[PDB]
Design a protein around this motif. Structure first.
Motif, short mmCIF file in Angstrom:
data_model
loop_
_atom_site.label_atom_id
_atom_site.label_comp_id
_atom_site.label_asym_id
_atom_site.label_seq_id
_atom_site.Cartn_x
_atom_site.Cartn_y
_atom_site.Cartn_z
N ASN A 1 19.50 39.37 84.12
CA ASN A 1 20.87 39.53 83.59
C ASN A 1 21.04 40.93 83.01
N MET A 2 22.29 41.37 82.87
CA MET A 2 22.59 42.64 82.22
C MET A 2 23.83 42.49 81.34
N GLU A 3 23.92 43.29 80.29
CA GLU A 3 25.10 43.25 79.42
C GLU A 3 25.46 44.65 78.95
N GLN B 1 18.02 42.00 80.77
CA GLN B 1 17.18 40.84 80.52
C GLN B 1 16.16 40.79 81.63
N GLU C 1 12.32 47.27 73.57
CA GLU C 1 12.69 45.87 73.43
C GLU C 1 13.67 45.67 72.27
N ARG D 1 22.14 46.81 78.33
CA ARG D 1 20.87 46.14 78.08
C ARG D 1 20.51 45.26 79.28
N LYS E 1 12.44 39.11 78.17
CA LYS E 1 12.70 40.07 77.10
C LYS E 1 13.99 40.81 77.34
N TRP E 2 14.70 41.18 76.28
CA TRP E 2 15.85 42.06 76.43
C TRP E 2 15.43 43.49 76.10
N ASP F 1 21.93 46.03 65.81
CA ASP F 1 20.80 45.89 66.71
C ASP F 1 19.60 46.67 66.19
#
Lengths: 293, 55
Positions: free
Chosen positions: B23-25, B34, A158, B32, B43-44, A150
């Motif tokens: 959303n989330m992850e 969204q 971001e 992270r 955007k993430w 990443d």
């Protein structure tokens, strides 16, 4: 059938192309079977308890590996640096073996290999002796490379690019303009270092530990709306609970001997390392390193 | 997600403006988000690196 681990194939006799599909199987004295297998596109799948197959990276996500960490397990890295408004590459000369230069391999004023010539063991020897560890490359060479981690725009938080994204000039530009002058990519080829795990991630529908656990749970328990505890406990009880799983001593001895481990004694249950080592041996076999049982 | 944010939450970003978490992850330092920002698209953001204020 007896307890242990077994590496096999279909002898190219399943699909018309005659492509040899390799597999691995862990059979315990008691408890669920665990199978890994390739498909004709060279993606890797896992079968738990003999049911329908799932992209293999799901089991690693369930064991708390991120996408980046999965890539760390299965690939070496090629580092690029941005410097003097030029793209440089950290060179491990042995990685050039068998390849034909697509640009002048040069360093310290000297040109080691011409843009047409095939790279020799002599070339590699001279490069190693001169301690060449960094060479300029054309920007075009970054294209198609796969980013290994990443990258974040730290001024905003971001995500600029996610681990396993394919690199392009546009993405390289974004990274560079975000201050990232060092970029890690996967060392792969289409021959004996295949990108199987990287491509498997692309067909893996899960993206973290909880979604992986839920995918497994839904597969094992149709009709049972999943809860946190239920998904966690089911997974723990597959391979990691002495109550429900036992390789047995004989199984552990044969397992360890297949993986060329020194120790004969070991656990009745599986570890993360057990599972990853079986995956790695199966990938070796596909890459032409070592053979089935 | 144990990260502090919730699905559907309205947030404010210094550059991206006001948005909604869609959303989330992930978990831990890897969580992270969204976010759909009104005039700046989706955007993430990595939660541990993004300054967000809860509108």
């Amino acid at each position: 059938d007896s307890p242990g681990v077994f590496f096999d194939s279909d002898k190219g006799k399943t699909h018309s192309s005659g492509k040899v599909l390799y597999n691995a199987r862990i059979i315990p004295y008691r408890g669920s079977w665990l199978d890994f297998e390739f498909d004709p596109k060279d993606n890797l799948f896992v079968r738990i308890d003999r049911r329908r197959k799932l992209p293999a990276t799901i089991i690693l996500r369930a064991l708390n590996y991120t996408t980046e960490q999965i890539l760390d397990l299965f690939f070496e890295k090629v580092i690029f640096e941005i410097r003097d408004n030029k793209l440089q590459m950290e060179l491990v000369p042995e990685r050039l073996r068998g390849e034909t230069a697509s640009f002048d391999i040069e360093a310290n004023g000297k040109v080691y290999v011409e843009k047409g010539r095939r790279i020799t063991a002599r070339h590699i020897r001279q490069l190693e002796k001169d301690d060449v560890k960094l060479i300029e490359v054309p920007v075009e060479y970054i294209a198609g490379k796969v980013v290994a981690k990443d990258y974040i725009d730290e001024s905003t938080g971001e995500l600029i690019c996610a681990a396993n994204m394919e690199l392009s000039l546009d993405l390289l530009a974004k990274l560079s303009q975000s201050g990232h002058k060092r970029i890690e990519t996967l060392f792969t080829n289409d021959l004996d270092h295949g990108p199987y795990i990287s491509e498997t991630l692309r067909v893996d529908p899960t993206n973290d530990r909880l979604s992986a656990l839920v995918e497994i749970y839904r597969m094992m328990r149709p009709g049972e709306p999943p809860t946190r505890e239920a998904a966690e406990s089911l997974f723990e009880n597959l391979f990691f609970s002495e109550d429900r799983y036992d390789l047995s001593a004989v199984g552990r001895m044969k397992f360890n001997r297949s993986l060329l481990r020194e120790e004969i004694e070991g656990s009745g249950i599986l570890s993360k390392d057990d599972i990853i080592d079986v995956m790695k041996k199966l990938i070796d076999i596909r890459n032409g390193k070592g053979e089935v049982d | 997600n144990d990260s502090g944010y919730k699905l559907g939450q309205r947030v404010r970003h210094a550059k991206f403006g006001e948005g909604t978490i869609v959303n989330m992850e992930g978990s831990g330092e890897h969580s992270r988000l969204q976010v759909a920002f009104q005039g700046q698209g989706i955007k993430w953001l990595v939660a541990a690196y993004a300054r967000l204020e809860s509108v």
